[PDB]
Structure 1
Amino acid sequence: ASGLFITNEGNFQYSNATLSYYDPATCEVENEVFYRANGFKLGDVAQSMVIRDGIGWIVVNNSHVIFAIDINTFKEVGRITGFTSPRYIHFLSDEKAYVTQIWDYRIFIINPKTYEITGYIECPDMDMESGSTEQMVQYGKYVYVNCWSYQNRILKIDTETDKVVDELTIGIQPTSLVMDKYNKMWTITDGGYEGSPYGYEAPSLYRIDAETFTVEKQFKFKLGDWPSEVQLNGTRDTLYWINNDIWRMPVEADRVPVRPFLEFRDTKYYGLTVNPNNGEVYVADAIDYQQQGIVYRYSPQGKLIDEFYVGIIPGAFCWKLEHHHHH
């Protein structure tokens, strides 16, 4: 049956990260599913998750590892260690995938089938001290990736050579990256922070053409905002993101709407996702980064459907959609 995974960062150096699994049909959530199925802790700061042919890959940022589990039993089928500080994983094939990192100038290349690191992609003009590669989107034989922490550019990678072939400098610290149905990528910066050794400025939302790798639209916000998590709906024509409130806009719009999708409620909207089949929007609220977090489920029209408590600091989602795998 269809379901939704929710990773929970937990607290840094507290090794209290956990995995939750929610059933939209029953409105029931199960917490600490990884530990309950495996007998050992997920780790420190679970960061993201992807599902590929009956296998879920969970990135645990501060545990230097990626866990491969059965999406039904949640039991571990394999794992890859040795990562500096893993962020996201993007599959190119059953034997090749990229794993971005923070505190590293290299993008780790791995072989999912053998569960080992096979190589590295060196990013130009960055080191280990402040290096950072985050989310990735694929465009034909190319893969685009945003450089977040103490960085200000998007890199273009040729998957046929595993090398960076181009770059684009934009606002400081782009946080995420998605591709719409017009082959236009979207990224939103967080503008750094006050007293930052790198910079502090008003953040912006960018619309960049994938083919020409050029900025087409730039929507600048207010100084002090720390936006993040650009997300798209199933048809990839409605963009959502976080900036105090949960915002949304048609990808063809010439301006950001004056009203948000979900108003700020003095808490801490941290994670976000949209059901690719029905458009329902799920918002992960960290509350205060201390107590147990909560997830809100809204209809496309913005009606509250359900809410459920998960783990500490829920920040990422992964949909488990039913479908027949190829043989």
Structure 2
Amino acid sequence: SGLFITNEGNFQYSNATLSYYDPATCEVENEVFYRANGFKLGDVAQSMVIRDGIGWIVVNNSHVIFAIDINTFKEVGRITGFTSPRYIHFLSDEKAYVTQIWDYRIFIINPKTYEITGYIECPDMDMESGSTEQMVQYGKYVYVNCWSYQNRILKIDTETDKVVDELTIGIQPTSLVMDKYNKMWTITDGGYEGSPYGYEAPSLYRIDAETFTVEKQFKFKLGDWPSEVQLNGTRDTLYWINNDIWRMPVEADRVPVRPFLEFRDTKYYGLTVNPNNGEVYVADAIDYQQQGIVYRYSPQGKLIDEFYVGIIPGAFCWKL
């Protein structure tokens, strides 16, 4: 088994990289895409998904998704022409969605043929400030958060590839997961000081998937800049970043008083939970300039291992 770490590098400097970690040996290999291919990913490696032996790496500011063999790391294909891609969600072997920033459309692709095959137009959205981000599936529907300069979750009918509903919440929901009770969780970042769109106290929401209604809202503090909801494998413990790493049972009616991992005046930036053994990996960007570090914790918050990765490690992908 193994773990991929994407490193965004510094936006507009083309220093994104890919790392691979073997939890059995506690060994990391850095710059593995370069090592295998003899050229680099580009600018802002954002996310990665594995399906059927192929890893799909989204390079947000290089207009491309690379497909690699998960064992040799060699490029086996790519899809180009994306405005500014974010996340990939597969509906079948021949259809996936690829969300975008700076676009009002979600690209449809055929992963088998490496082609763009359609577009989904989002309502009340333009290229100048458009954003679609993470996706969860609920039956024939996909829910998607709209992050940058947006304040919505959209609901897409995957039969017709159409947006069929929307829910307005606090500004800039960052991320989206679905728990075992078919409740979605999203956490907003609250914008930023001087934003043209807004700056506010951010919130964590629990949203019923069936009825698309907010059930819980936990509001934090003005100045907080949270992100990155994540679930354990059984989808009953939620983790997120808000300075510290926090977690709580998805049945909770109150937020925790003690964090999983205390803030240490660095930059916790990426987060995953091993879906089989519950170990928690925290990617620390440190100061957004130096080489980042990943910290690996037991389910009880004891440090098992830590290892240097690339610059601004932001996402993980499990190879199971």
Name the TM tier (shorter chain).
over 0.9
Structure 1 position 13, deviation (Å): 1.3
Structure 1 position 195, deviation (Å): 1.2
Q: Distance in 2 between matches of 1:234 and 1:12?
A: 32
Task: Tell me the secondary structure at the aligned position of residue 62 of structure 1.
Answer: helix
* Ranges of 4+ aligned residues in structure 1 off by more than 3 Å: none
Structure 1 position 122, deviation (Å): 0.0
Task: Tell me the secondary structure at the aligned position of residue 277 of structure 1.
Answer: coil
Structure 1 position 143, deviation (Å): 0.2
Task: Tell me the secondary structure at the aligned position of residue 230 of structure 2.
Answer: strand
- Superimposed CA distance per residue, residues 170-213 of structure 1 (whole angstroms, 9 cap, x where no aligned partner): 00000000000000000000000111110010000000000000
- Superimposed CA distance per residue, residues 119-152 of structure 1 (whole angstroms, 9 cap, x where no aligned partner): 0000000000000000000000000000000000
Task: Tell me the secondary structure at the aligned position of residue 137 of structure 2.
Answer: strand
Task: Tell me the secondary structure at the aligned position of residue 35 of structure 1.
Answer: helix
- Superimposed CA distance per residue, residues 211-269 of structure 1 (whole angstroms, 9 cap, x where no aligned partner): 00000000000000000000000000000000000000000000111111000001000
Structure 1 position 154, deviation (Å): 0.1
The answer on 1:310 being equivalent to 2:305 is no
Structure 1 position 64, deviation (Å): 0.3
Q: Distance in 2 between matches of 1:291 and 1:304?
A: 22
Counterpart for residue 156 of structure 1: 155
- Superimposed CA distance per residue, residues 44-90 of structure 1 (whole angstroms, 9 cap, x where no aligned partner): 01000000010000000000000000000000110000000000000
- Superimposed CA distance per residue, residues 146-169 of structure 1 (whole angstroms, 9 cap, x where no aligned partner): 000000000000000000000000
Unaligned runs of 5+ in 2: none
- Superimposed CA distance per residue, residues 25-54 of structure 1 (whole angstroms, 9 cap, x where no aligned partner): 000000000011011111101000000010
Task: Tell me the secondary structure at the aligned position of residue 36 of structure 1.
Answer: helix
The count of aligned residue pairs is 320
Q: Distance in 2 between matches of 1:153 and 1:101?
A: 15
Q: Distance in 2 between matches of 1:93 and 1:39?
A: 31
Q: Distance in 2 between matches of 1:195 and 1:285?
A: 26
Q: Distance in 2 between matches of 1:205 and 1:266?
A: 23
Q: Distance in 2 between matches of 1:248 and 1:85?
A: 31
Structure 1 position 16, deviation (Å): 0.5
Q: Distance in 1 between matches of 2:84 and 2:255?
A: 34
Aligned-residue identity in percent: 100
Measured on the aligned residues, the alpha-carbon RMSD in Å equals 0.3
Q: Distance in 2 between matches of 1:256 and 1:54?
A: 39
Q: Distance in 1 between matches of 2:257 and 2:180?
A: 24
Structure 1 position 12, deviation (Å): 1.1
Q: Distance in 2 between matches of 1:164 and 1:266?
A: 41
Unaligned runs of 5+ in 1: 322-327
Task: Tell me the secondary structure at the aligned position of residue 37 of structure 1.
Answer: helix
- Superimposed CA distance per residue, residues 265-303 of structure 1 (whole angstroms, 9 cap, x where no aligned partner): 010000000000000000000000000000000000000
The answer on 1:298 being equivalent to 2:287 is no
Q: Distance in 2 between matches of 1:283 and 1:12?
A: 21
Q: Distance in 2 between matches of 1:186 and 1:50?
A: 20
Task: Tell me the secondary structure at the aligned position of residue 239 of structure 2.
Answer: strand
Task: Tell me the secondary structure at the aligned position of residue 318 of structure 1.
Answer: strand
- Superimposed CA distance per residue, residues 80-110 of structure 1 (whole angstroms, 9 cap, x where no aligned partner): 0000000000000010000000000000000
Q: Distance in 2 between matches of 1:287 and 1:103?
A: 28
TM-score, structure 1 normalization:
0.98
Q: Distance in 1 between matches of 2:193 and 2:42?
A: 31
The answer on 1:39 being equivalent to 2:34 is no
